[PDB]
């Protein structure tokens with residue numbers, strides 16, 4: 001078939017960047033490059049979540065066309081996916097891990113402050129600003145995300161007729177955001193080590209069983225490279241109990257992230273990006 005005429009009106013379409021599919025396009029008005037995500041026919045709440053969020057490490061929506069398929073126009077991230085930096089047991093300098101992870105933490109912190117849980121954080125959904133190693137990252141893909149109740153309403157009686165399991169669920173309610181911190185844990189583990197914590201590669205233990213026990217695959221030889229501090233943070237994010245797991249605030253306060261050089265590099269990268277006159 002063809003691209004829709006409203007899209008064609010504003011954009012010249014071009015090569016595939018990835019794949020669900022992402023294409024290169026040029027905005028006609030500006031002659032600048034954009035990315036167009038095509039979702040073959042919830043997207044309208046993803047759009048509405050993305051419209052309202054404003055953070056430098058979260059992807060912005062430029063335009064939207066709901067046609068035969070959906071078309072989401074976004075800023076082009078020249079560095080591609082973090083996934084490509086970590087496949088085939090490739091891995092990043094610990095310093096590069098920290099810079100990227102710091103930014104992931106700020107993004108997810110901002111999400112959680114604003115009542116949004118992402119629910120699908122993985123290396124594919126972390127985009128790099130450039131092909132430089134030191135760059136900005138943005139989190140994308142909010143198609144599984146949730147806005148943070150019926151429980152609160154339920155607890156306004158008088159539980160004369162209320163079922164025990166509802167009363168039991170009160171102990172653990174309101175920690176759904178901790179799933180994001182788990183994922184961040186897994187991504188950090190991968191970035192630091194070049195391999196996955198939980199995997200069916202050369203184990204008899206099921207993936208499910210590995211995850212619910214929290215018994216990640218530790219290969220000391222791969223990790224001898226890595227600081228104890230980095231591994232300590234991983235350990236606090238890969239905690240099975242969601243009430244005990246580190247929050248993004250706790251992670252940002254961890255020794256590993258008290259790194260003024262890393263933080264300066266990030267502030268520098270932001271300035272470069274931003275780049276109107278001000279009173280004084």
Ligand SMILES: C/C(=N\NC(=N)N)c1ccc(NC(=O)Nc2ccc(/C(C)=N/NC(=N)N)cc2)cc1
Nearest residue numbers: 017018022035037077078079080081140141142143
């Ligand atoms: C230019 C380029 N890579 N160059 C390179 N040398 N690797 C890019 C490759 C992939 C790439 N990926 C994306 O932009 N990926 C996205 C963007 C948005 C989304 C969204 C919003 N998805 N929503 C959804 N419901 N699925 C998903 C994936 C950007 C740039």
